[PDB]
Each structure stands twice: as structure tokens, then as C-alpha cells.
Paper text:
Here we determine and characterize cryo-electron microscopy structures of the GluA1 homotetramer, fully occupied with TARPγ3 auxiliary subunits (GluA1/γ3). Desensitized GluA1/γ3 substantially deviates from this behaviour and, despite the limited NTD and LBD resolution of this highly dynamic state, we could trace major transitions throughout the receptor. First, the GluA1 LBDs splay into pseudo four-fold symmetry in some 3D classes, reminiscent of desensitized kainate receptors, and of GluA2 receptors lacking auxiliary subunits. Second, the NTD dimers translate into a parallel configuration, where some classes adopt an ‘O-shape’ conformation, as described for heteromeric GluA2/3 and GluA2/4 NTDs. Interestingly, these transitions take place despite the presence of TARPs, whose extracellular loops remain associated with the LBDs, and accompany their motions. As apparent in 3D classes, transition of the LBDs towards four-fold symmetry largely involves rotation of the B/D subunits. The B/D LBDs undergo up to 90° rotation along an axis perpendicular to the M1 gating linkers, with the M3 and M4 linkers accommodating this motion. The appearance of non-domain-swapped receptors reaches approximately 30% and is greatest in the class closest to four-fold symmetry. Together with a study implicating subtler GluA2 LBD rearrangements in desensitization, a complete rupture of the LBD dimer interface may lead to deeply desensitized states. Closer analysis of the three sets of desensitized structures reveals a gradual transition of the LBD tier into four-fold symmetry, which is greatest for GluA1 and smallest for the edited GluA2 mutant: GluA1 > GluA2(F231A)-Arg743 > GluA2(F231A)-Gly743.
Numbering used by the authors:
A (entry chain A): 566 to 767, 781 to 815
B (entry chain D): 508 to 545, 566 to 622, 630 to 649
C (entry chain A): 390 to 503
D (entry chain E): 5 to 41, 55 to 84, 92 to 158
E (entry chain C): 602 to 624, 629 to 649
F (entry chain B): 602 to 625, 631 to 649
């Protein structure tokens, strides 16, 4: 009963743990079935256990929301713009997290810093999740509002500040410029300009995870139907 | 909690296609077994396919080359799906802000009047 | 005519599409361009938007003690106003005068959304 | 019960063909929020996605299937919709054999080929569903 | 059979969760949790 | 059968935990004693 065809069928059935029509009876045959049964038990258990680890660590990944907590905590190489208020803010900081970030940024090689905001934007876009251009919230928001919208602001703001119109110390334009800014603010001009230039710019396993095993089953069903027709012609001739 | 939460590990689409595959496998296994030279009726095929998918076996097994191809692939599909269900459930049993509430507008937010 | 130093940065100051057809302060567009226009109107002065040469906002190199970028342009006299998104900082306030802030902001993290 | 058995086959073969050929023609496969031209509730199908409400309700466009050969082949199969079309073609041939069975009773292979066509049509329908969901 | 397949997979899945989850170091560890109460000596 | 069912489930569950766990200073050197640390003599 254990010809070449049934031996292949019994071995496949034992590996899929689906049983078989017959079982080996001789001592020599039962030894082969014994180690094959043990081999199947270890491999199938390994496949199920590894898949569980594969789909757990995939979960329990965690995004970031100001990962600055552990700062980069990883290869998201966070940088800043060179010769900007953000670099100076990090350099002169005395907060534990910010001091840790600065000590990392100053010593890290290659330079995490960039020469222009566009350079940092392209560095994050072309680092595929490997760069983070600590930048000002206004620029961050404007960028995230424009295509290729593949970038996003994470967490809140590290601090609060504002832009000002500068003049040389002892300049006669200081007073008029201050009054002009107050006038422009009280008349809604700054609000309208901001709105114009910023706003008006504008789980269960899925079938995709196991789609391959469905194609194999249908492909196997179709092949079996073709094989059956071939034996029909061969037997009838 | 949920009454039918035991179906959560696999999506609703996967469960629907498992039923469709089970119907298709039984019909094909009945077809190739009947018009072949060498008791797989339509009802026996459905019983065998339900047992094969659920790892409980059956008293009768295919004997033809074309019939055994159908049983072999159905067994392999069963092992991947059953292992997938157990692995995903284990992940489920192992393992959110004011900004979130500010960004959305589906949950209405109000203030005190004259305040 | 006063020299108003500025920096290229979207959307504060940008080169207009086909800037070659235009010349001077009219070659650029953006929030800070219109803000400089409105400030000039209210204060009553003429101005030429000169882009900073270094392309840097401003910092005092600790070794040379030299200010570079827009802050350097303002301190050394090469420029009379700066209408760029220039952050108000203590170190800068010690060497240049700032008006009341015209926009609020904070340092924020940007990550590939993918 | 051969007379009733053939009545079930004739009724079912037309019913299967009518049901599948309506699904391919109709555009109510999926209820997803998209844009026909503001994101609004839309109803899509195998060829066109159409808005359910809004100002542009009732007017809609053709689905742009195309924006790593795995995504090329899957999208080319999904764009052409050959598998759902193949099931309709197989059902049409299977229906023809059932009708011709009475008109030609000399050969018995006419009614067996019909049974093969319907099984093949059902298998192609399963693949079309999986490709559509993927 | 279906009741058998669901329950045994539940047993294996939950046992894996039992064995994995089960597996101080700092000041935050005490401040951060609330299950362990921590005290000091009075007038010290 | 009951002994087999519990033991096989235990093997699969413990292996899943085994694979999952590995997938997931000066003070440190001073606190421990398993690693010995030294310096250069007359340095």
C-alpha cells in the first residue's frame, strides 16, 4: 500500500497535520513517520510562534508625539537650520531634554544641521522617515498644507515666541515701525495676510495580508481540473 | 466587550472569502472525483472539506491524482489561515489627547453663556 | 530710499513666477513683501528689498564675535530695516531693536507623514 | 426528477448570468467617501465612482486605477476587470450548452461541459472579488 | 468542531499573552506608577 | 490527550514569548560587580 504515490500523499498529510488513510506498520517504516511527525510539530509551532512575534512587535510600535522625550531615541536624525533662532535656542538651553538634544546635535556626524528650510524639508522627504527638521511651527504648518503633503507636524510646540520687524540700534525708524505694526494688527491686516498666505494655500488581519494563499488555492483548483481532463482523455484512449 | 468578538482576529472580508473558498473547493473536489476512473459525493465532499479546514480529519480521503491536488492545496490554505488566526489573537491579547479632540468636529464642543 | 534686508523663505518672500519679466522689489511676492509694502505706506518711506547675501537669518559667531546674515546686515549699517520672519531673541534684542511681534510661533517637529 | 432538475438548471443559469452581468454594469459596489470631479459620500463600482449627495450629486467620472511588478500586475488586472468579465463570458457559454442540451440529446458531453463552465465561472468570480478587495 | 477550534486557539493565544507580558531602576519608576505606595520617616 | 494538548500549547506559547522579547554608563559600571574594571598602574 506504501507505493511511491501513497508515500508522497502520507508525508504531505502528516506535514499538514490532517491525518492520512493509512499509517506505517513496520518498525523501519514507523521510524520514518516518527521523526517526520516530530519535524512537523517543531516547524509548524515555529511558524505560528514567529508569526505571533511578527504581528506583536508590528503592533506595540508607538509613533512619537514629541519623541524628544527620548529625543531622536532613534535614527530619525533630528536637525535644525544653521545660524537660526532654533539652533541658538538649543545651544543656550538648560532644560534637561533640550541640553541632551543639543549635546547630540553638536557632536553628531554627519552634520544634522541644514543650510535652508527647503534643504531640511527635502532631507525629511528623502530620508523616508530618517530625518526631522526641528523648525518653526508657522513654516511647518505651511509645508504640511502643500503637496507633496507627505510630511506632518508631531506633538505640540517646544516653546512660544514671535517674529518682529528689526531695525539698527538707535535707528529713527524704530518708533514709527512699532506704531505701524500696532495699526496693522488692530486693523486685521496681519490676520488677513496670514489667512491668505497660509489657509488659502490649501486591528484585524486584512485580505491583503493573506491574499497569496487564496491565489494558490484557486490556482491549485484550476490545475486539478485540467489534470482530471487529461486523465479522462488518456483513459478513454 | 462583544458577543461575537471571537471573529475579531480576521477581518470580515477574510471570513466571507473562506466560506466562498470552502464552497468552491467542495464543488471542484466532487467534480474531479466523480468523472474519474480511480465515495466522494457532493455531500461527502462538503463533509470532508469542512473537516479538512477545521483540522479534524475524516474517515474517507481522496485517492486520485486530481483529487489529491484539491485536498493538498485546501490543507495548505487551512494551515496558513488557522495559524494566522491564532497568531493575530495572541497579538490582540498582548497589547487619546486634547489636540485629537480639537482637530475633529464630529464631537460638538461648547462654552458657558455670558462667560 | 532705505535698504530693507530680507531672506528667501516660502511663503514670507518668494520670487514671482517668471520674475525675469519684473525687476527690483517687484520681483518678489509673499507675506513679508505685502507687510513691508504696508509698513512703508504707514511710515511714509521708499525702500528696496535686498535679499541677505549669506542666506542666513542671523547669529554671532562665538569665535570671531561677528554677526552674520540679516542681523549682521542691520548692525553694520548695510540695511535700515529687516522685514523677514526674524525671531525675537534676547541676544538679538541686545544689538538691534524689534517692534511688537507680528506673528506667533514655536519650535515644532516635522516628520515624514508616510 | 430529471424534468425538475433541468428546470432548476435552466432557471439558475439565466439567474446567475443576469445577476453577474448586472453587477459589472452597475456602479454600486462600494460606499466610500471620495470626490467626484470637498469630500462627500460616494458610491463606486468597477468602472466609475459617483457621488451620493452634494452639489455634484448624480454627475460622476471614470475611476483612475493607475496613479514592484506586484502592484503593476494587480492594478492592470483590477483596471481591466478581466476576471469579472471572464465569469460573465463563462456563464454565457455555460448557458448556451444548457439550452442546446435539449436540442441535441445525441451527445451527453453537452450537459457536462455546461457543468464545467458554471464551476469555472464561479472560480473566476472568487478571484475577481479578491482582486477587487486587495 | 468549531467550538473546539475557537477555544483551543483562545487558550494558546491567551497563554502566549500571559507568558510574554511577564517580561525599578530610577526615580521616575516610583513617581510614574501608583500601584506601589512609597513613604518616608516623619520629622526627618 | 490532555497532557499532549497542554504541553504542545505551552511549547508554542513560550516560543512566541521567546521570539517576541528579543524582537522588542559609569554609574551602571559602578553598581554592578559581574564586570571587573581597571586602570593603568602609575598613570
Amino acid at each position: 500500500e506504501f507505493g511511491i504515490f501513497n508515500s508522497l500523499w502520507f508525508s504531505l498529510g502528516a506535514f499538514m497535520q490532517q491525518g492520512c488513510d493509512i499509517s506505517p506498520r513496520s518498525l523501519s517504516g514507523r521510524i520514518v513517520g516518527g521523526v517526520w511527525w516530530f519535524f512537523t510539530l517543531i516547524i509548524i509551532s515555529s511558524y505560528t510562534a514567529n508569526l505571533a512575534a511578527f504581528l506583536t512587535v508590528e503592533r506595540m510600535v508607538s509613533p512619537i508625539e514629541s519623541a524628544e522625550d527620548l529625543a531622536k531615541q532613534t535614527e530619525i536624525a533630528y536637525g535644525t537650520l544653521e545660524a537660526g533662532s532654533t539652533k541658538e535656542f538649543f545651544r543656550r538651553s538648560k532644560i534637561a531634554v533640550f541640553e541632551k538634544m543639543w549635546t547630540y546635535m553638536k557632536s553628531a556626524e554627519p552634520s544634522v544641521f541644514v543650510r535652508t528650510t527647503e534643504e531640511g524639508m527635502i532631507r525629511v522627504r528623502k530620508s523616508k522617515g530618517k530625518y526631522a527638521y526641528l523648525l518653526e511651527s508657522t513654516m511647518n504648518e505651511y509645508i504640511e498644507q502643500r503637496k507633496p503633503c507627505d510630511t506632518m507636524k508631531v506633538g505640540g510646540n517646544l516653546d512660544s515666541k514671535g517674529y518682529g520687524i528689526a531695525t539698527p540700534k538707535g535707528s529713527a525708524l524704530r518708533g514709527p515701525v512699532n506704531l505701524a505694526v500696532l495699526k496693522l494688527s488692530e486693523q486685521g491686516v496681519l490676520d488677513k495676510l496670514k489667512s491668505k498666505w497660509w489657509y488659502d494655500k490649501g486591528s484585524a488581519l486584512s485580505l491583503s495580508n493573506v491574499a497569496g494563499v487564496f491565489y494558490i488555492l484557486i490556482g491549485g483548483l484550476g490545475l486539478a481540473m485540467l489534470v482530471a481532463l487529461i486523465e479522462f482523455c488518456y483513459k478513454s484512449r | 466587550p462583544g458577543v461575537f468578538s471571537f471573529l475579531d482576529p480576521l477581518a470580515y472580508e477574510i471570513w466571507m472569502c473562506i466560506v466562498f473558498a470552502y464552497i468552491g473547493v467542495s464543488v471542484v473536489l466532487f467534480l474531479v472525483s466523480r468523472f474519474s476512473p480511480y465515495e466522494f459525493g457532493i455531500f461527502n465532499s462538503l463533509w470532508f472539506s469542512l473537516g479538512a479546514f477545521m483540522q479534524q480529519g475524516c474517515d474517507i480521503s481522496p485517492r486520485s491524482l486530481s483529487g489529491r491536488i484539491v485536498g493538498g492545496v485546501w490543507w495548505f490554505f487551512t494551515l496558513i489561515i488557522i495559524s494566522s488566526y491564532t497568531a493575530n489573537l495572541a497579538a490582540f491579547l498582548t497589547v487619546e489627547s486634547a489636540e485629537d479632540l480639537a482637530k475633529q468636529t464630529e464631537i460638538a464642543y461648547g462654552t458657558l453663556e455670558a462667560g | 530710499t532705505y535698504i530693507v534686508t530680507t531672506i528667501l523663505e516660502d511663503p514670507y518672500v518668494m520670487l514671482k513666477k517668471n520674475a525675469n519679466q519684473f525687476e527690483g522689489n517687484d520681483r518678489y511676492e509673499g507675506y513679508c513683501v505685502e507687510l513691508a509694502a504696508e509698513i512703508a505706506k504707514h511710515v511714509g518711506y521708499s525702500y528696496r528689498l535686498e535679499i541677505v547675501s549669506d542666506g542666513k537669518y542671523g547669529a554671532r559667531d562665538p569665535d570671531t564675535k561677528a554677526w552674520n546674515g540679516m542681523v549682521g546686515e542691520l548692525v553694520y549699517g548695510r540695511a535700515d530695516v529687516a522685514v523677514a520672519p526674524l525671531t525675537i531673541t534676547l541676544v538679538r534684542e541686545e544689538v538691534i531693536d524689534f517692534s511688537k511681534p507680528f506673528m506667533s510661533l514655536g519650535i515644532s517637529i516635522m516628520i515624514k507623514k508616510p | 426528477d430529471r424534468g425538475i432538475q433541468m428546470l432548476i438548471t435552466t432557471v439558475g443559469a439565466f439567474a446567475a448570468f443576469s445577476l453577474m452581468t448586472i453587477a459589472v454594469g452597475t456602479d454600486y459596489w462600494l460606499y466610500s467617501r471620495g470626490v467626484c470631479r470637498e469630500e462627500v459620500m460616494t458610491h463606486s463600482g468597477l468602472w466609475r465612482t459617483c457621488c451620493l449627495e452634494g452639489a455634484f450629486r448624480g454627475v460622476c467620472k471614470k475611476i483612475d486605477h493607475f496613479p514592484d511588478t506586484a502592484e503593476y500586475l494587480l492594478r492592470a488586472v483590477r483596471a481591466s476587470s478581466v476576471f469579472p468579465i471572464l465569469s460573465v463570458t463563462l456563464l454565457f457559454f455555460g448557458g448556451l450548452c444548457v439550452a442546446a442540451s435539449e436540442f441535441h440529446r445525441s451527445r451527453h458531453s453537452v450537459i457536462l461541459s455546461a457543468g464545467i463552465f458554471f464551476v469555472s465561472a464561479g472560480l473566476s468570480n472568487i478571484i475577481g472579488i479578491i482582486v477587487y478587495i486587495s
